[PDB]
Write a protein that binds this ligand. Structure first.
Ligand SMILES: [Zn+2]
Ligand SMILES: [Zn+2]
Ligand SMILES: [Zn+2]
Lengths: 378, 87
């Protein structure tokens, strides 16, 4: 069912993203299901919501290489063009695939151009996309990278200049991840980690059996408290796992309870348990939901939907006004609902707020003898 | 020969136009601050940002006024197209 546009965007993501559900379905199953959602779109008033969350999900999926089917993923752009989405929305969507294609060519051009040397050449991938279209947050999450990865920054940077001048790269480490080798005392494993997790774990490299406090990790990592808290939590409390990679001091049930003095240490007995028997070797993905949507990002997305609404309502009202020079509130509301028809449905409260804003800004004015009827002026 | 070692890495960078995170180009106040019209006529009855598919960014109020003379980007000269209004 899912009437709510956002539930519908999440659902779509659950099908286009590598997920337990995405795995339990064939192309055809997925495909048909993606269409039985777009169909239900013609009954959604606030279409701008689905469009914005769908695009936000698509962004993570392409930036993180987590599409279940490059095919289905791309064919979705036409499926949207069919159900009637605007050519402008659909077109910027198609623009994102182009951007990725352009990014992957630039990836190789780098991998070969640089067979000469920090790391085994090919083991390093890069993705460089335009900010205006791939950035969704104005917030920047900083992280001090371990030398073993910082020596790459200047490499990738020079390569980009002689290719494109007058440009500047902004590292989006929150969206960076990789694989590392954890050499225990029971074995050695390959952990699919988040770059922030990486930075955190590498803090013990010249002090393997040392305990480090939260505060000191914050100094060595330079992560903002919020991020550091959840990153650390994913390492001392990865769900369902029987043995955590990291151990901490006063026990808690929430990363909120960590304090300056909480001590962390590398568990020298970490191991994967395949067949109830310790495994001296193996591979695990500890990224979890660390690179997926957060509550904060949601408030950000909604603020964006609200910004565009207000702007689009102001333009629509003036426009209707720049046509009739005098109109009744009743009449304004209804032919205004029509122009915003394919985006959302403004509520009376917002309209009054805008109209109100328009009066004090001298674009319109109420009638001399009528608290309603508005008169265009200027 | 340590406990944690990098086997593989996927870095990500989002590009913008070099100069400096400096002010509006059409107008000239900091892209994050008020614009010629707001910071001056904020004496009575919100200068935000807008992007172009060309990845150039200005105050929405400055690039809107300019687009009326010609629908192209002030910096390069390609057909203009709003990419994003979100901050
Ligand atoms: Zn302004
Ligand atoms: Zn431009
Ligand atoms: Zn400006």
């Amino acid at each position: 069912e899912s009437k709510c546009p956002e539930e519908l965007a999440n659902y779509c993501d659950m099908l286009l993203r590598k997920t337990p559900l995405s795995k339990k379905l064939t192309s055809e199953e997925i495909e048909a299901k993606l269409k039985e959602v777009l169909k239900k779109l013609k009954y959604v008033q606030n279409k701008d919501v689905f469009m914005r969350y769908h695009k936000a999900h698509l962004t993570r999926r392409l930036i993180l290489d987590i599409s279940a089917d490059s095919e289905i993923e791309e064919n979705m752009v036409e499926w949207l063009r069919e159900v009637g989405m605007p050519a402008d929305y659909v077109n910027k969507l198609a623009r994102m695939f182009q951007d990725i294609k352009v990014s992957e060519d630039l990836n190789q051009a780098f991998k070969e151009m640089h067979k000469n040397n920090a790391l085994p050449a090919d083991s390093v991938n890069i993705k460089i996309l335009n900010a205006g279209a791939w950035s969704r947050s104005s917030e920047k999450v900083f992280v001090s990278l371990p030398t073993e990865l910082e020596d790459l920054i200047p490499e990738v940077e020079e390569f980009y200049k002689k290719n494109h001048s007058g440009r500047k790269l902004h590292w989006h480490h929150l969206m960076s991840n990789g694989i590392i080798t954890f050499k225990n005392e029971v074995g050695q494993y390959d952990l699919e980690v988040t770059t922030f997790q990486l930075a955190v774990l590498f803090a013990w490299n010249q002090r393997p059996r040392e305990k480090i406090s939260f505060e000191n990790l914050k100094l060595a990592t330079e992560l903002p408290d919020a991020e550091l808290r959840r990153t650390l939590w994913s390492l001392v409390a990865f769900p369902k796992l029987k043995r955590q990679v990291l151990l901490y001091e006063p026990q808690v049930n929430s990363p909120k309870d960590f304090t300056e003095g909480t001590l962390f240490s590398v568990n020298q007995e970490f191991s994967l348990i395949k067949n109830a028997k310790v495994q001296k070797r193996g591979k695990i993905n500890l990224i979890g939901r660390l690179q997926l949507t957060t509550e904060r990002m949601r408030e950000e997305e909604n603020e964006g939907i609200v910004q565009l609404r207000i702007l689009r309502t102001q333009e629509a009202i003036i426009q209707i006004m720049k046509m009739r020079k005098k109109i009744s509130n009743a009449q304004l509301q209804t032919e205004l609902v029509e122009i915003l028809k394919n985006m959302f449905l403004p509520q009376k409260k917002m309209i009054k707020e805008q109209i109100e804003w328009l009066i004090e800004h001298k674009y319109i004015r109420r009638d001399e003898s009528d608290i309603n009827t508005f008169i265009y002026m200027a | 020969k340590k406990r944690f070692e990098v086997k593989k890495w996927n870095a990500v960078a989002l590009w913008a136009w070099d100069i400096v995170v400096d002010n509006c180009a059409i107008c000239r106040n900091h892209i994050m601050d008020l614009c010629i019209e707001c910071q001056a006529n904020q004496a009575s009855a919100e200068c935000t940002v807008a992007w172009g598919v060309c990845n150039h960014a200005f105050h929405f109020h400055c690039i809107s006024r300019w687009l009326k003379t010609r629908q192209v980007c002030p910096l390069d000269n390609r057909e203009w197209e709003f990419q994003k209004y979100g901050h």
